[PDB]
């Protein structure tokens, strides 16, 4: 039929901040997963549940493309069964994840001298995220009894902080773009396939 728009996702001009991670549905279409696992740009390419290359012969009822910008050392946090502020407060994958995690360094675009403080992350949260939950609150985190009168104060912190991406930073503190491909194996009709 038609080819899947994986391009628009990976080669997208502007990328999202992890707390406001973006999700795109993969409609009836077929994509070449090889053009992905045949590119050397990718820093991290880990596939869970599935076999990387055999995907070009498989079919899936839905596919979801979540994308966000994170820190190098935080890419280890976007994997099934992980703790951390990213994996607990910004983007959690389910223990039975059946998809792939793709990520590359992006100092070239996301970092600027003086720093691109536009990408953000949730530092505090009253409870961990649920698999694929999203939280774009901006409410003062109340850590103690004293109520935060919608203002930052003692034991009262604003929950979202900004990555500072300066090109001189270290790989682990360098910007890395991440696309998580969620593959849905359901009894339903399978409209996302490869080389049949």
């Amino acid at each position: 039929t038609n080819l899947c728009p994986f391009g628009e996702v990976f080669n997208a001009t502007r990328f999202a901040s992890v707390y406001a991670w973006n999700r795109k549905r993969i409609s009836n279409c077929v994509a070449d997963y090889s053009v992905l696992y045949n590119s050397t740009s990718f820093s991290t390419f880990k596939c869970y549940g599935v076999s990387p290359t055999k995907l070009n012969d498989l079919c899936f009822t839905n596919v979801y493309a979540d994308s966000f910008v994170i820190r190098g050392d935080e890419v280890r946090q976007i994997a099934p069964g992980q703790t951390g502020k990213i994996a607990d407060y910004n983007y959690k994958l389910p223990d039975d994840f059946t998809g792939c995690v793709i990520a590359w360094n992006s100092n070239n675009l996301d970092s600027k001298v003086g720093g691109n403080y536009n990408y953000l992350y949730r530092l505090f949260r009253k409870s961990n995220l649920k698999p694929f939950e999203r939280d774009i609150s901006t409410e003062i985190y109340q850590a103690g009894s004293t109520p935060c009168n919608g203002v930052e104060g003692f034991n009262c912190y604003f929950p979202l902080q900004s990555y500072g991406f300066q090109p001189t930073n270290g790989v682990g503190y360098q910007p890395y773009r991440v696309v998580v491909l969620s593959f849905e194996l359901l009894h339903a009709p399978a409209t996302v396939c490869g080389p049949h």
Binding site: L123, A143, N155, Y157, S162, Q166, V171
Partner: protein, 593 residues
């Protein structure tokens, strides 16, 4: 609900963030200055220091609201203690208003100090570039004496009132921060708590310093005898074969390092000293190669290799673009995985060694980067420079020099150049130990109010004669403030680091050269290729300030406190030679002129 410790953990989680972000911005500012001097960049560095200060003071107040006695995970307790134990600025804004200006006043005097040759009063010279040279290269008793007295007079007598006030205010700040005197406050840096017998009490530092210096005294005495005797041949009519040494006749403007008395004290002058500089020149080495060889050293023991940021962003060679630059070796941690080195490196053996020293710093920096911000530092003020020196000791051994390809493979270690080298070592390393111990003991006593101002200089020199074996060229009344004539004293810096640092390294070296199964004189070991050394060392470099410095030490050397035995060992060859050479001489100094 949520305990004081839980709330405070969150509090620290937030500080760390705002701290590392704003430190990284300060750090980048200071880099842009030190590496490119412009009125603009100078301004911006000051601006960022302002924002940084504001942040730290506010956070320190907030930190004091989480009562330490309710925090119970010792790691967190250490972080909180560091954050809230900052109150040098915790009294009348008036006190901080001008009693910081006296501090500033002092530095300006020291920095603008000028003394004129009485024979050529028109020829007035500054310390930094015009007198330090005389005091290092001159053999004229009268010239050296006019420089020494001119400095201690023009500047010290001015700094005298200032220092007095400085003492009363600093003691007030200390008392305010629950410390007996500015002395107890400074000796805080050695205080530690945690586990069993891994804790350390500020009131032990004195003991251990004294105890260890007691054990160094023999060694020093003999070095003193030997230096005295040789000096008698240069300055006869001035040195008693049985008394103390005139303070102006030493290596520099103070008797801090006897390093520049080598030409006058060389053991066997005929034999030259290993100077690979010519080798490097002929082999067309450059700055990058020096640092690449350093990197190999650390890799061969199992430490990581330099980041790519390191190679891309470091100033490793004085700039030709015109930028004015501070040419002093520094090793930077700009708090985001950004590590760098600023060094106007030149192709010389010294620069080679110091490159290994500075990268030693970077390696420490890199190893503790896995720690929370407030724990990202050496176990105490001695550990960093101890680690750096370890590197430079291995790098310089004739063994290592051959493997690198800078010696001739068939090089011979005659027991004579070994003695020459060990002497030069002693002239810097051992010589400063007495000076350092005395200077801090004088300051500590003054802060404890055990030296009434009427007897300030009267004890200063009294102690100089008893401990350092040095006597004053001319007599000085209490109008003088000779101790303030040192950048560290008039610029408000702890000095005991320089002593403890020294005892710490040799412990380290004897521990890593013991893991490399090195056989023979410790002064001749190269930990190169020894991964067991690498691990022994790394397993403490990671700790940073996160465990009590006693524990870190034990993990490496196997002991919880200073032990001077490795130092003494490092010099034991020199020690025996010295004892013979002083057999038919008096060792010791009659305390009086």
């Amino acid at each position: 609900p949520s305990t004081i410790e839980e709330l405070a953990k969150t509090f620290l989680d937030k500080f760390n963030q705002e701290a590392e972000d704003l430190d990284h911005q300060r750090s980048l500012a200071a880099w842009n200055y030190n590496t490119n001097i412009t009125k603009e960049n100078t301004e911006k560095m000051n601006e960022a220091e302002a924002k940084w200060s504001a942040f730290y003071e506010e956070q320190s107040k907030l930190a004091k609201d989480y009562p330490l006695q309710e925090i119970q995970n010792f790691t967190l307790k250490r972080q909180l203690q560091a954050l809230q134990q900052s109150g040098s600025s915790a009294l009348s804004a008036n006190k901080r208003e001008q009693l910081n200006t006296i501090l500033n006043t002092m530095s300006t005097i020291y920095s603008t100090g000028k003394v004129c040759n009485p024979k050529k009063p028109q020829e007035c010279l500054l310390l930094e570039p015009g007198l330090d040279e005389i005091m290092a290269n001159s053999t004229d008793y009268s010239e050296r004496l006019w420089v020494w007295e001119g400095w201690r007079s023009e500047v010290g007598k001015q700094l005298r009132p200032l220092y007095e006030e400085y003492v009363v205010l600093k003691n007030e700040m200390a008392r305010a921060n629950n410390y007996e005197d500015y002395g107890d406050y400074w000796r805080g840096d050695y205080e530690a708590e945690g586990a069993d017998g891994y804790g350390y009490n500020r009131n032990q530092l004195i003991e251990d310093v004294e105890r260890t210096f007691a054990e160094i005294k023999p060694l020093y005495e003999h070095l003193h005898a030997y230096v005295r005797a040789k000096l008698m041949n240069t300055y006869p009519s001035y040195i008693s074969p049985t008394g103390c040494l005139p303070a102006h006749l030493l290596g520099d403007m103070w008797g801090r390092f006897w390093t520049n008395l080598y030409s006058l004290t060389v053991p066997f002058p005929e034999k030259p000293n290993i100077d690979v500089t010519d080798a490097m020149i002929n082999q067309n080495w450059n700055a990058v190669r020096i640092f690449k060889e350093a990197e190999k050293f650390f890799v061969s023991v199992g430490l990581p290799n330099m980041t790519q940021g390191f190679w891309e962003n470091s100033m490793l060679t004085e700039p030709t673009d015109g930028r004015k630059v501070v040419c002093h070796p520094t090793a930077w941690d700009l708090q985001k995985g950004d590590f760098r080195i600023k060094m106007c490196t030149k192709v010389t053996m010294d620069n080679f060694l110091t490159a290994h020293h500075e990268m030693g710093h970077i390696q420490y920096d890199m190893a503790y980067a896995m720690q929370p911000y407030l724990l990202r530092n050496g176990a105490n003020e001695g550990f960093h420079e101890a680690v750096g020196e370890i590197m430079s000791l291995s790098a310089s051994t004739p063994k290592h020099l051959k493997s690198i390809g800078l010696l001739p493979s068939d090089f011979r270690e005659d027991n004579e150049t070994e003695i020459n080298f060990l002497l030069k070592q002693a002239l810097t390393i051992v010589g400063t130990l007495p000076f350092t111990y005395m200077l801090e003991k004088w300051r500590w006593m003054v802060f404890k109010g055990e030296i009434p101002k009427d007897q300030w200089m009267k004890k200063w020199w009294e102690m100089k004669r008893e401990i350092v074996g040095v006597m004053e060229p001319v007599p000085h009344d209490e109008t003088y403030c000779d101790p303030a004539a040192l950048y560290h004293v008039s610029n408000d810096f702890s000095f005991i680091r320089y002593y403890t640092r020294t005892i710490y390294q040799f412990q380290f070296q004897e521990a890593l050269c013991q893991a490399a199964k090195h056989e023979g004189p410790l002064h001749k070991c190269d930990i190169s290729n020894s991964t067991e050394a690498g691990q022994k060392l790394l397993n403490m470099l990671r700790l940073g300030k996160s465990k009590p410095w006693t524990l870190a030490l034990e993990n490496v050397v196997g002991a919880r406190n200073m032990d001077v035995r490795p130092l003494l060992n490092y010099f034991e060859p020199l020690f025996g030679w010295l004892k013979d050479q002083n057999r038919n001489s008096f060792v010791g100094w009659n305390t009086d002129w």
